[PDB]
């Protein structure tokens, strides 16, 4: 339960699979994710 | 030479740490832990 894998959609249509931290607040991940 | 980075830990707690620029990660992940 410490992490979750999800697909992130980006510009013009690319889908990328990523393993995210399940408990950190979302605002902390958006920058490095970009 | 050195660098400072935000190290995330348990339950997502944010911590700030200073690390060497040239040493490999394997020799620093242990004392950092």
Swiss-Prot record, chain A:
The gene is eccD5. Was identified as a high-confidence drug target. It comes from the Bacteria. Belongs to the EccD/Snm4 family. It is found in: Cell inner membrane. Disruption phenotype: Mutants are defective in the secretion of EsxN, PPE41 and PE_PGRS proteins. Mutant is highly sensitive to detergents and hydrophilic antibiotics such as ampicillin, vancomycin and bacitracin. Virulence is attenuated both in macrophages and in the severe combined immune-deficient mouse infection model. Part of the ESX-5 specialized secretion system, which is responsible for the secretion of EsxN and a number of PE_PGRS and PPE proteins, including PPE41. Part of the ESX-5 / type VII secretion system (T7SS), which is composed of cytosolic and membrane components. The ESX-5 membrane complex is composed of EccB5, EccC5, EccD5 and EccE5. The chain holds residues 18 to 51 of 503 of the full protein. This is ESX-5 secretion system protein EccD5.
